Amino acid sequence: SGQFELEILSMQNVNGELQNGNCCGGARNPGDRKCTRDECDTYFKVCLKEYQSRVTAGGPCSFGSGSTPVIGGNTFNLKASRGNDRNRIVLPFSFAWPRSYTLLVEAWDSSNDTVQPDSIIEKASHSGMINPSRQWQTLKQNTGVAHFEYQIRVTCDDYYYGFGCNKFCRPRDDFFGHYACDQNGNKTCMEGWMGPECNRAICRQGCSPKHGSCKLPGDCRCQYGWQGLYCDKCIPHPGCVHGICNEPWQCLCETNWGGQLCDKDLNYCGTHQPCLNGGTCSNTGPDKYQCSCPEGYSGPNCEIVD
Template sequence: MWNKLVEAHRFLILCLLLTVYAEVCQSSGFFEVQLISVENPSGRLLSGDCCDSEGGEADGSCGPDECDTYFRVCLKEYQLEVKTGGSCTYGLEITKVIGGNTFQFRGAQKGGHDTGKIVIPFQFSWPQDYTLIVEAWDKDNDTHSSGDELLIERSIYKGKINPGEEKQTVEYRSHIATIKYTIRLRCDEHYYGIRCNIVCRPRNDYFGHYVCDQFGKRHCMEGWKGEDCKTAICKQGCSPTHGTCDIPGTCK
């Protein structure tokens, strides 16, 4: 009998450790960029050259071969003077080729389109302040190209953002191209707070009986009380001295 109790106790401890480990290993949230539209009517690079260097015509316009546009999104710490090089300390995502000179993602503003959505997960307490660099590039099989030779446009946006469902719209215009996109920050499931660092996972088992509100605060289920909602509320009239219960609404 004693051995069975010891084994049961060890099993419960193991389950608790696995639960805590799973919560720690999950990322705490993600930064989302949803592309809405790109307008590059002339099909040019930031340098003024044509995306297709061999497609220029005598009148100075670019040929029919359009840019092969892909995006590089860099998220880093807030910088007063932004350095476009260096490490993307909060995360980096690079898309495949998703369009030509001018294109748009219909329904993106209403949240009904996943194409053009770029998600950067993070596994740290969100600092609120950030720098976002969204770059449009021309894909070229010429391996001799280097530096910013194939850069179409670069949008730099920085500030403060808190988690939420609402999206912020950013529109960057230049003499070369216009890029429009939305941004938002969201906590992962079971993570709460302005830094996505409050963990609350609803449960109804040996370790507690509670649900979580929008702020990540625990609320005991009906029939339970205590810090972890592990204490059953006994049947009304149950003696506080001689009565006890393991199941709500009972008394022994």
């Protein structure tokens, strides 16, 4: 989104003549050929269109057209003046600025009280190249009887960048992005954000790429069944005692532990030493054993004496 602006700087028509050779409304004085009966009522028409190597006099004003109201007589100098809504033409555009253009600028005499219509004083035309910039470029139409000067520029609208004023960037800090804008309209992510729109939170250094995730920067939220600072430890089956997991909800037994919960001792003899009075213990199953009793002892643990 941009604007092509045109400002009138000066007009000099010392005798008050039209392009056709006649005076701006009135009779020419025989001899001195001075136009003394009236002065021009000078206004300007502007036509902006696509580049033409061979500039046509007519045709459509594709990029826009405009006119100023009457802004002075035969001669006026606005060079030391500021320039207001009356002596300037604004031509907005929403298409990417093509750099190349054709510009028609004409000085006209107003006649809205007499028999004759509005008549052209002088015409300027050219084709050129212009990039977005706040800097004005002066152009002078000083080849005919009436001379005029004007300045032009192309400016980008707010948050627009590049040669076509077409690249949009407005800084943001919400669920659509967390960034600032470059001098080129590029997005520069706030600390803790990544991706083209700076909308992907950077997770805790070491966060599991398989089981860890983000919503806010610096965190590590675990996938269901995963735990730990880096979400890289599985959660064993609830109820698991002497077992481990490689995957969530597993209960893989440690040595000499049995059962789905790894709570059944396969070395009851080693852990409890239940055979009393010099008896020998034998592991025979989960939480199971058998005692072989010396002479004079009886019972499951050789506890019955005599």
